[PDB]
Design an enzyme around this catalytic site. Structure first.
Site, PDB file in Angstrom:
ATOM      1  N   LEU B  52       0.924  -1.290  -0.026  1.00 18.77           N
ATOM      2  CA  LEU B  52      -0.073   0.021   0.225  1.00 18.77           C
ATOM      3  C   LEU B  52       0.759   1.209   0.021  1.00 18.77           C
ATOM      4  O   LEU B  52       0.254   2.326  -0.357  1.00 18.77           O
ATOM      5  CB  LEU B  52      -0.895   0.153   1.239  1.00 18.77           C
ATOM      6  CG  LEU B  52      -1.710  -1.323   1.652  1.00 18.77           C
ATOM      7  CD1 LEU B  52      -2.682  -1.119   2.840  1.00 18.77           C
ATOM      8  CD2 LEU B  52      -2.259  -1.799   0.585  1.00 18.77           C
ATOM      9  N   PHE B  57      12.320   4.713   5.178  1.00 15.75           N
ATOM     10  CA  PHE B  57      12.580   3.697   6.213  1.00 15.75           C
ATOM     11  C   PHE B  57      11.988   2.411   5.843  1.00 15.75           C
ATOM     12  O   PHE B  57      12.418   1.598   6.707  1.00 15.75           O
ATOM     13  CB  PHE B  57      12.140   4.270   7.700  1.00 15.75           C
ATOM     14  N   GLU B 130      -7.593   8.051   3.942  1.00 15.73           N
ATOM     15  CA  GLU B 130      -7.397   9.416   4.636  1.00 15.73           C
ATOM     16  C   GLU B 130      -8.552  10.268   4.348  1.00 15.73           C
ATOM     17  O   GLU B 130      -9.015  10.336   3.162  1.00 15.73           O
ATOM     18  CB  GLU B 130      -6.124   9.811   4.064  1.00 15.73           C
ATOM     19  CG  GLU B 130      -4.824   8.942   4.234  1.00 15.73           C
ATOM     20  CD  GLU B 130      -3.471   9.576   3.582  1.00 15.73           C
ATOM     21  OE1 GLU B 130      -3.464  10.723   2.922  1.00 15.73           O
ATOM     22  OE2 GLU B 130      -2.386   8.948   3.701  1.00 15.73           O
ATOM     23  N   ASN B 174      -3.286  12.662   7.784  1.00 14.89           N
ATOM     24  CA  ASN B 174      -2.934  11.623   9.116  1.00 14.89           C
ATOM     25  C   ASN B 174      -4.073  11.185   9.706  1.00 14.89           C
ATOM     26  O   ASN B 174      -4.187  10.566  10.729  1.00 14.89           O
ATOM     27  CB  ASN B 174      -1.990  12.354   9.850  1.00 14.89           C
ATOM     28  CG  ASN B 174      -0.665  12.294   9.731  1.00 14.89           C
ATOM     29  OD1 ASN B 174      -0.304  11.471   8.859  1.00 14.89           O
ATOM     30  ND2 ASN B 174       0.286  13.145  10.292  1.00 14.89           N
ATOM     31  N   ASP B 187      -0.133   7.740  12.612  1.00 13.83           N
ATOM     32  CA  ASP B 187       1.258   8.341  12.422  1.00 13.83           C
ATOM     33  C   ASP B 187       1.925   9.094  13.528  1.00 13.83           C
ATOM     34  O   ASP B 187       1.721  10.407  13.582  1.00 13.83           O
ATOM     35  CB  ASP B 187       1.338   9.011  11.212  1.00 13.83           C
ATOM     36  CG  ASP B 187       2.928   9.123  10.802  1.00 13.83           C
ATOM     37  OD1 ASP B 187       3.027   9.349   9.639  1.00 13.83           O
ATOM     38  OD2 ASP B 187       3.817   8.832  11.655  1.00 13.83           O
TER      39      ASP B 187
END
Lengths: 18, 343
Positions: B52, B57, B130, B174, B187
């Site tokens: 997704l 990172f 979102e 978020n 998050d």
């Protein structure tokens, strides 16, 4: 208009943190 | 005064009940904070379904638990890439916050583990996606619609702030909308547990409080400023401060001037002038009455705070309906064991 200014800003997509 | 005896007694008792809930809330949080949970699943418990997302990172993948068929959003983090990007403390802290908090509007960490190469955070999967995409699609939310989301954020911040947590990255990007139409905050990468003041330059330009821009120390009142930005953007369709480069956004943020669309109600404009308040001694959320200045504001007069918390209010919008996804190697050698002992 403010909305037109928003579009012209180039910042209508998902925004990254700094 | 504004309230006769019955309304004043009712409000007083409600506020006292909140204190009592927050006190037990802190107690539950601190136990898990001081003794975090580790290693509660393993990779082969899940079927890889779809990537997704991808990032600096690591990646996010929709996975399916083999035993139960439940879907989850699995954050996979490359330990070596985390180390090279100087993100060890953020990663550790994010996981430690998520495993300790408990609130109906915060995305839940269901499992976490690590292997030789990666860290894994298995989260509740929110297929609605979102708020950002719904907002851009619909254009703007009507004030009752914006208010229902704002109330959930007010409650979530009241909860986090009682734990001495500052969130620091509020934005529609978020905020996920679950299948009952309610908000899931996601998050915690910039959240920090700090009682006093902190100094890190972090957040998203449109949402930064002036005192972050001005290199002051700052406190949890930056989240209440960000709430003002969020409410404005939800109700207008665009944020109060924008320009094509961040620096010009910061100039507007610190100027002390905001303009409103003509369709904003006077109650909404009043609330936003008190949230988007440069002067910290006047910013709602930061005064002697704390969050009650916000909860008691005229724009929230129809808000039943308990019914929202209990999720009994019919949402204004339900994303269109499990597993709809429309709208990875493991070294033989362990990498960065010491750095991630706590994960």
């Amino acid at each position: 208009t403010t909305y037109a200014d928003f579009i012209a800003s180039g910042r209508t997509g998902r925004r990254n943190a700094i | 005064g504004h309230m006769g005896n019955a309304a004043a007694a009712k409000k007083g008792s409600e506020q006292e009940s909140v204190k009592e809930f927050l006190a037990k809330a802190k107690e539950e949080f601190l136990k898990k904070w001081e003794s975090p949970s580790q290693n509660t699943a393993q990779l082969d418990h899940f079927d890889r379904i779809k990537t997704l997302g991808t990032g600096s990172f690591g990646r996010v993948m929709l996975v399916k638990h083999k035993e139960t068929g439940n879907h989850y959003a699995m954050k996979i983090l490359d330990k070596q890439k985390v180390v090279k990007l100087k993100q060890i403390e953020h990663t550790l802290n994010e996981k430690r916050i998520l495993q300790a908090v408990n609130f109906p509007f915060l995305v839940k960490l269901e499992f976490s583990f690590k292997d030789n190469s990666n860290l894994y955070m298995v989260m509740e999967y929110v297929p609605g996606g979102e708020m950002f995409s719904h907002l851009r699609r619909i254009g703007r939310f009507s004030e009752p619609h914006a208010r229902f989301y704002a109330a959930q954020i007010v409650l979530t911040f009241e909860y986090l702030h009682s734990l001495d947590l500052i969130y620091r990255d509020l934005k529609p990007e978020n905020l996920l909308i679950d299948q009952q139409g309610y908000i899931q905050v996601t998050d915690f990468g910039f959240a920090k547990r700090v009682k006093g003041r902190t100094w890190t330059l972090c957040g998203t330009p449109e949402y930064l409080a002036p005192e972050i821009i001005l290199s002051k120390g700052y406190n949890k009142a930056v989240d209440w400023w960000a709430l003002g930005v969020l409410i404005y953007e939800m109700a207008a369709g665009y944020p109060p401060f924008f320009a094509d480069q961040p620096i010009q956004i910061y100039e507007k943020i610190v100027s002390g001037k905001v303009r409103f669309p003509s369709h904003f109600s006077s109650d909404l404009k009043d609330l936003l002038r008190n949230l988007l308040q440069v002067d910290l001694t006047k910013r709602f959320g930061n005064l002697k009455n704390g969050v009650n200045d916000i909860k008691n504001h005229k724009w929230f007069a129809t808000t039943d705070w308990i019914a929202i918390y209990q999720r009994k209010v019919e949402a204004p919008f339900i994303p269109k309906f499990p597993g709809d996804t429309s709208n990875i190697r493991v070294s033989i050698n362990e990498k960065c064991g010491k750095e991630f002992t706590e994960f």
